[PDB]
Amino acid sequence: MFMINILSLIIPILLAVAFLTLVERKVLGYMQLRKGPNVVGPYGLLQPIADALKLFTKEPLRPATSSISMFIIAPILALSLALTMWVPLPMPYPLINMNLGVLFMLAMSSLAVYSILWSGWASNSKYALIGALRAVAQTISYEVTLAIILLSVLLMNGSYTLSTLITTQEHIWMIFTSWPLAMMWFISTLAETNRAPFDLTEGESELVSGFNVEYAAGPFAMFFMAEYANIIMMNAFTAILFLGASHDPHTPELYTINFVLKTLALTITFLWIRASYPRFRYDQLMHLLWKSFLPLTLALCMWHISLPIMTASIPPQS
Amino acid sequence: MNIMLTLLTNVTLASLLVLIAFWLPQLNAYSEKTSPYECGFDPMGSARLPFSMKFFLVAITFLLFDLEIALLLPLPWASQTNNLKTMLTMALFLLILLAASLAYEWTQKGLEWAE
Amino acid sequence: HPAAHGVLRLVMELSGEMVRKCDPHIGLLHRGTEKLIEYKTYLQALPYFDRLDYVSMMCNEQAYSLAVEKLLNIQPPPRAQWIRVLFGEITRLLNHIMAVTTHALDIGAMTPFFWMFEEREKMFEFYERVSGARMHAAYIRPGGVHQDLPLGLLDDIYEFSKNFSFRIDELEEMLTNNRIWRNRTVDIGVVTAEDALNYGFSGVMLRGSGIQWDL
Amino acid sequence: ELVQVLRRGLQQVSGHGGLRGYLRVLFRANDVRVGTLVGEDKYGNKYYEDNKQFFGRHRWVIYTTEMNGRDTFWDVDGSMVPPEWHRWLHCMTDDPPTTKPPTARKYIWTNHKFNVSGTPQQYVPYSTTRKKIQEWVPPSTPYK
Amino acid sequence: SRGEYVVAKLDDLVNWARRSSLWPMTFGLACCAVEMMHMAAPRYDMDRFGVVFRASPRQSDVMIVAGTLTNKMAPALRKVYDQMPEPRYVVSMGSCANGGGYYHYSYSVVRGCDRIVPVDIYVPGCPPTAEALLYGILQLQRKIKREKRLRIWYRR
Amino acid sequence: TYKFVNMREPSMDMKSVTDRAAQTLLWTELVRGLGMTLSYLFREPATINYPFEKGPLSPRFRGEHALRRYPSGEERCIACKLCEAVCPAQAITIEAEPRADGSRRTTRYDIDMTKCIYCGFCQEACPVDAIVEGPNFEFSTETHEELLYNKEKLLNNGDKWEAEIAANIQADYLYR
Amino acid sequence: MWFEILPGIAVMAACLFIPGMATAHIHKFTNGGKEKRVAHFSYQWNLMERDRCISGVNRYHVTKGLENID
Amino acid sequence: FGREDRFLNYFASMRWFGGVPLISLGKETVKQPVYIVDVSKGIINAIKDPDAKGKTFAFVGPNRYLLFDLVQYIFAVAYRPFLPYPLPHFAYRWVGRLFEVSPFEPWTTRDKVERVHMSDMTLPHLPGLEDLGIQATPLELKAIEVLRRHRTYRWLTSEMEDVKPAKTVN
Ligand SMILES: COC1=C(OC)C(=O)C(C/C=C(\C)CC/C=C(/C)CC/C=C(\C)CC/C=C(\C)CC/C=C(/C)CC/C=C(\C)CC/C=C(\C)CC/C=C(\C)CC/C=C(/C)CCC=C(C)C)=C(C)C1=O
Ligand SMILES: CCCCCCCCCCCCCCCCCC(=O)OC[C@H](COP(=O)([O-])OCC[N+](C)(C)C)OC(=O)CCCCCCCCCCCCCCCCC
Ligand SMILES: CCCCCCCCCCCCCCCCCC(=O)OC[C@H](COP(=O)([O-])OCC[N+](C)(C)C)OC(=O)CCCCCCCCCCCCCCCCC
Ligand SMILES: CCCCCCCCCCCCCCCCCC(=O)OC[C@H](COP(=O)([O-])OCC[N+](C)(C)C)OC(=O)CCCCCCCCCCCCCCCCC
Ligand SMILES: CCCCCCCCCCCCCCCCC[C@@H](O)O[C@H](CO[C@H](O)CCCCCCCCCCCCCCC)COP(=O)(O)OCC[N+](C)(C)C
Ligand SMILES: CCCCCCCC/C=C/CCCCCCCC(=O)OC[C@H](COP(=O)(O)OCCN)OC(=O)CCCCCCC/C=C/CCCCCCCC
Ligand SMILES: CCCCCCCC/C=C\CCCCCCCC(=O)OC[C@H](COP(=O)(O)OCCN)OC(=O)CCCCCCC/C=C/CCCCCCCC
Ligand SMILES: CN(C)C(=N)NC(=N)N
Ligand code: SF4
Ligand code: SF4
Ligand code: SF4
């Protein structure tokens, strides 16, 4: 039955990734006064299927100068970690109920960083190398900021368990409690997922597709799937962490509906931001977190250490 | 057990997708098809040559600050102790030292990229 | 390359990502227009100017027509001159829309591109109604213009002009005070007035540097 | 309120003749609008107008399911319109062929032909001029 | 036959995705490239048809040779076409790309991009309207529909 | 006259300083951009449903070429080669000879549509309105040779589009 | 109009419903119609093991009570 | 032999199957491959030659190699390790039988193994490229055109002269 549960977690996530591709296309079109895909099927519903079939029936090539061993591993690692990030999320019952349900997320994200690095380096191309180093810098910045922000927010919670996050947010919302950390965390999630205005590793205007310049057909589709799965997963993480839904043990479907609605709202906000804003410059992104977010993040961490102690509201350990 | 099973499942699915991608479609590869891409012209040098890293100092500071976050992570359990005064004093000591390190680097221009 | 306008080879020497020297290689779109003009007549050479700067078509045509009329010692009629000025300003709007929107697209903003290109489509409709060609009109000729305006063109141009200030305001609501756009564009490519004059810059470059010069 | 718009959608479902016609128009034209029928030509193409729509979408055409000898249920071309309806659709005039028929000439084709490229009916170029130089023809009677 | 039926349905399935998922390379020359931009503009939105521009030739299916091809540019165009993986299609747009255009008798112009790359569709004009190029794209899609690769393989 | 685009200076009073600080901390202009994008989302798109809806055109439109006839059926062209002389791209080739009835009629009239720039000088220079640039523009071909028209192809185009061409010429001939 | 974006969003939402609902149903199915026992600590794990031992069927979710003591 | 050929590609694609199986270690087979451009030029010249109407031409290369030497040179130019081993003829035939069950283009067949093992005939009486006016291009000049694709990034840029010519049998 556990294998059935794993499949039920995996396959709908990939379906949601494909239809998120479609939704982003249409949302950007209507924000840009276009229509978006509406020809392939009824309201363009078959467009993701057409694109997937085309990509997996098209020829993939390996560059002559490429290191083939790490050329193949990078999409495998990216997709595997994108799917693995979904196992501890409670909706409202996690597939795997990890006691430290957040450090696993941090470690797997840091490991998923290396997929783009190894794809860029293995490609043996200058644009891929530039994209890889942009990934290095972006990872530095968002890693330190994410670590401190998450520490503070979970310090308001009591432990590193997401079901405990639900129980904490039973009455009110962490967005109400700690909205500055929430805004900085949203920016950090944008940077982590490489979405605009921080799409530096794959900046089309400055680089020709960045790290995946040499990737075509199936391997490229795996990078796209991993990116969109990470987008949805991080939006779900933000929704669980800051927008806590009410949970009824006897009818847990209501929590699932609320969680999915919040996740969709955050993902549509991601697409909205991409449509609205220009692109950063990676040195300006590094100076944005270190020189603006990091000082305020340290101050807010001190404040959120002191607040439960000074108000006699330290959360229960269990 | 379950975590190993799901890791195996994800890796197997990704590997199967790679196998399908590299064996289903028709392949016709020649020398120019697989050549490196440099916007239509041949590359002047090699991509394996040294590539200057203008933020080398910031990477080392990132290493040290990663240590700092490693130290700061067990705070949620440290708030359950009876010695709340000592715990708060030492936590604020660590955070103040981290802030002082950031301030020193910023004022000595360690955060400015090399020209 | 998306930012290289398709036909520019820019050989760059980078230390990391800092630029050490730029060596633009041009001529990938060299056609021998001047030689072909030498081989064509005066009327047969107008489309060559029509295709030189394909975002200011009637402006190129007006420049060529002014040169030919100056050599011929003739004078266009006042209605022809007014049509030339009106369509020159329409073409200036077209070119500025293209320039600003492609700049914002290279920087990472595309919705202004789409909006202003709908506006460009309307101005292309004006071009096509007056000439029969949507962009390469070949309408302004030595001595005046080829044909007179249709009997609804002025009203349609008035409607478009009335409903365009809001489009410009919507464009400015997205970029002018945006901190990301200011970070990308402020203090980038600074050229002094003396350097601009010596290098032979003209128009927007001089006026941005602060030189009060407009032909 | 949205109730009125839902009622309009259901009317469009009923206006097209039910679920079957609505689906057929949706899956072959990607739009389910209803408008006044301006006319229909000899090839089966129908033409509708709706002045309430903005300029550009206030005139449209539903293509026939079979033209000449081609099964045109799905693969609809933009060259299938005859010249008169082409002019009306592209808005070179506000007078439809039904109201203002064009002048009839004895040489104008009775049946319109779409783009025949890729078919054995495609145009093939050739020289339309005869041979410039005539070669000498030696006698058939031997001299000896 | 069962085999012929299976290969016919499979070929229809494969041709449908390629027909409805065209990803042209971001590649434009001279004046004809502006009409591609107006095609991508809201008025004649190409994205609704499944036509999406991509920058890398590896991730591109169609090359739209839109504008004049010069002698100094021909090697680069051939290089990017070669680096574009199969299946790949070519649409030449405008008189310059079709034949010589206004610059046919020029020392530095290639009289037709088909001297360099095999061209699948020719779009005539100077420049062809955005509607004309959209018609050319739809004609290319219809050309893709008639391909029978699995049917050729089965009867081979 | 002239005007300064960026020459203003901000007031340093406490209220303005606090407003700027709030804009910096609370991303007010970013929210404004989001609001503008949302407005455009809720607006109606300008996309037309091609090919079922066609973009507007004018009687002066230059499209595919055609050779016209008099109402009697006789060809209008008199082999005067004015179009060939004025053609900027040299895309027209003409060869003529006396016909069986002595008329001045062409035997070869070729137009290279891969060389033509669609500038419309040929229909301006024609003194009999024989060669015209019709309204058709959807004539893309799968092979190069199909775009090398000859007299038969151009006469076929004229016969095919005669009604629309005649209507457009009637509508626009008073401006010529 | 803008409401043609809804069907894609509706399909994506339906796809995202499946994981959580399926996990809840599988938890209830494999735990005797009750929530899966959460054992974050050795005490709770020992409770689960004792429940397995007392049940006599090697299933912790099979609960015994007063009718079992007497 | 050429870019899209079978010969050089077939011999250079045995990398994936560990070592190189050869019948009698390739010591009993002598082959003289001919260049594709030379073949095409001869075909074109035979059309323009008026006194080649009803004839039979043999197109062979200028050098004859043992199969072992030829495969060794192919692997040396491709910069791949060469590990040959003798495989009995019946076993090689069975291997070819296994590979020909592919509905697609087979990698190798029993007939292909037979042809590879067979030595190229000598037909002095028939005319050739020198009779048609074409000088046969030696393998050592155009081998790098085909076998450079089979190299890795380590040896991609190694020059043509870097590899000694194979030992001929004349
Ligand atoms: C001159 O030059 C030019 C320029 O200057 C160079 C320019 O600037 C421009 C201007 C250009 C622009 C302005 C364009 C930029 C602006 C835009 C708005 C473009 C936006 C672009 C995008 C948004 C692209 C992003 C989208 C992409 C890349 C598409 C990717 C699509 C996908 C589908 C991703 C792949 C997903 C996959 C593979 C998911 C697969 C899923 C599975 C495997 C799961 C399987 C599940 C199952 C099997 C379960 C099945 C279950 C059931 C019930 C089915 C059973 C039924 C049966 C019948 C079997 C122009 C025009 C130009 O010309
Ligand atoms: C024989 C197997 C060999 C596998 C080799 C490859 C994987 C190597 C790592 C070890 C195996 C996987 C983890 C096993 C854990 C066993 C214990 C367990 O289940 O604990 C439950 C715990 C439960 O969480 P908990 O510990 O917080 O709770 C305790 C238990 N309860 C809930 C009862 C209180 O699981 C975890 O904590 C999950 C941790 C996952 C860590 C994964 C580490 C490896 C990641 C990949 C490494 C390799 C990268 C390669 C990169 C690419 C190279 C080419
Ligand atoms: C949303 C999904 C995401 C993941 C998608 C993963 C891919 C799914 C693809 C499914 C369809 C695959 C169809 C075959 C594609 C062949 C590609 C190719 O190169 O073809 C040209 C080649 C052409 O071969 P050739 O013989 O012409 O080769 C000579 C080529 N030259 C001359 C250039 C050298 O065709 C083949 O090789 C034949 C392939 C036969 C089919 C292979 C198995 C396909 C099985 C599909 C599922 C079947 C289900 C049961 C039947 C159902 C019937 C209704
Ligand atoms: C279930 C396990 C799968 C493992 C991987 C197998 C490959 C397929 C992976 C899944 C994707 C399938 C997609 C559709 C089908 C296409 C792929 C496929 O099936 O290719 C088959 C390949 C296809 O050859 P191909 O190179 O033409 O593949 C391209 C296929 N098309 C044309 C469709 C693009 O065919 C064979 O392998 C036939 C021969 C089988 C026997 C030999 C196998 C190799 C040699 C091994 C033995 C070597 C020693 C010999 C002596 C032994 C005794 C001592
Ligand atoms: C996981 C492995 C891969 C999964 C693949 C199977 C899952 C997807 C199933 C197929 C997706 C839908 C395919 C059918 C699309 C129908 C859409 C409809 O519009 O197409 C019509 C008919 O579709 C095609 O013409 C027929 C080919 C597509 C169907 C192939 C037959 C079924 C193949 C097997 C399907 C199940 C797969 C089983 C084996 C895996 C004609 O469209 P077209 O004329 O172009 O458009 C012209 C433009 N218009 C609309 C404005 C006029
Ligand atoms: C506090 C740690 C250091 C302890 C003493 C070690 C001395 C020797 C080691 C030196 C390393 C310490 C470096 C950190 C301080 C040096 C930074 C510095 O020089 O400038 C400080 C910088 C200068 O800014 P500007 O001059 O305006 O910049 C102009 C740019 N154009 O301003 C600062 O002071 C920032 C420092 C912020 C954190 C400082 C940490 C100390 C604060 C202690 C407060 C808590 C005390 C606890 C009392 C509790 C009472 C109940
Ligand atoms: C409490 C109720 C009352 C509320 C009102 C109290 C508010 C006042 C409290 C003290 C205010 C502190 C003001 C000091 C900040 C101004 C310092 C300053 O301006 O430095 C200038 C200069 C400008 O930056 P540039 O690099 O030059 O920008 C590029 C220009 N081209 O800044 C610097 O050089 C950096 C200065 C060191 C940065 C320190 C940041 C790290 C410390 C913050 C972490 C959290 C606080 C730590 C604990 C605080 C308590 C000990
Ligand atoms: C201005 N021109 C000609 C472009 N091709 N521009 C562009 N942004 N691609
Ligand atoms: S065909 Fe005409 S519009 Fe196109 S590139 Fe050539 S001159 Fe410019
Ligand atoms: S439109 Fe201009 S280029 Fe074309 S045939 Fe007529 S005169 Fe020549
Ligand atoms: S200008 Fe008119 S009449 Fe004269 S040759 Fe040309 S088509 Fe004939």
Side-chain angles (χ1 to χ4, degrees), chain E residues 72-131:
Chain E
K72 198 174 183 176
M73 179 56 175
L77 176 135
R78 182 62 208 192
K79 188 63 168 299
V80 295
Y81 173 80
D82 283 331
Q83 291 182 327
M84 188 165 56
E86 300 187 9
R88 50 192 176 186
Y89 310 94
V90 182
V91 175
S92 72
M93 174 158 71
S95 305
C96 293
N98 291 11
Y102 209 0
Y103 320 93
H104 186 276
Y105 308 103
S106 182
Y107 53 89
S108 179
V109 172
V110 183
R111 298 126 205 166
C113 66
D114 41 347
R115 292 174 173 256
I116 314 297
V117 295
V119 179
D120 283 62
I121 296 293
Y122 297 81
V123 184
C126 178
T129 65
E131 253 172 351

Side-chain angles (χ1 to χ4, degrees), chain B residues 36-43, chain C residues 9 28, chain E residues 72-73 75-76 79-80 83:
Chain B
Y37 171 79
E38 193 85 339
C39 301
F41 284 102
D42 294 334
Chain C
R9 178 188 184 182
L28 287 75
Chain E
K72 198 174 183 176
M73 179 56 175
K79 188 63 168 299
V80 295
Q83 291 182 327

Side-chain angles (χ1 to χ4, degrees), chain D residues 122-127, chain F residues 144-150:
Chain D
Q122 68 178 44
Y123 164 68
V124 181
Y126 56 93
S127 178
Chain F
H144 194 159
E145 292 80 2
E146 294 176 28
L147 292 177
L148 275 62
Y149 289 177
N150 54 4

Side-chain angles (χ1 to χ4, degrees), chain A residues 49 52-53 56-57, chain B residues 20 24-26, chain E residues 6 9-10 13-14 18 149-150 152-153 156, chain H residues 104:
Chain A
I49 305 176
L53 274 177
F56 274 83
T57 51
Chain B
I20 295 178
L24 181 64
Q26 179 75 4
Chain E
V6 166
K9 304 311 288 179
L10 229 56
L13 175 61
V14 172
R18 298 173 175 172
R149 307 193 180 191
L150 306 187
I152 282 302
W153 162 85
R156 181 178 296 263
Chain H
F104 330 102

Side-chain angles (χ1 to χ4, degrees), chain E residues 60-77:
Chain E
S60 304
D61 314 332
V62 185
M63 166 186 290
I64 305 181
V65 184
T68 311
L69 182 63
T70 55
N71 293 335
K72 198 174 183 176
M73 179 56 175
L77 176 135

Side-chain angles (χ1 to χ4, degrees), chain A residues 131-172:
Chain A
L133 270 86
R134 293 188 174 189
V136 169
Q138 188 169 349
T139 301
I140 287 177
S141 312
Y142 73 61
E143 172 67 19
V144 64
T145 309
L146 277 167
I148 302 288
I149 290 176
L150 209 32
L151 163 67
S152 302
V153 178
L154 302 170
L155 179 68
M156 187 72 263
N157 176 32
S159 65
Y160 295 88
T161 309
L162 317 173
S163 57
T164 305
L165 278 173
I166 302 176
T167 306
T168 293
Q169 295 178 121
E170 173 169 345
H171 278 170
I172 62 158

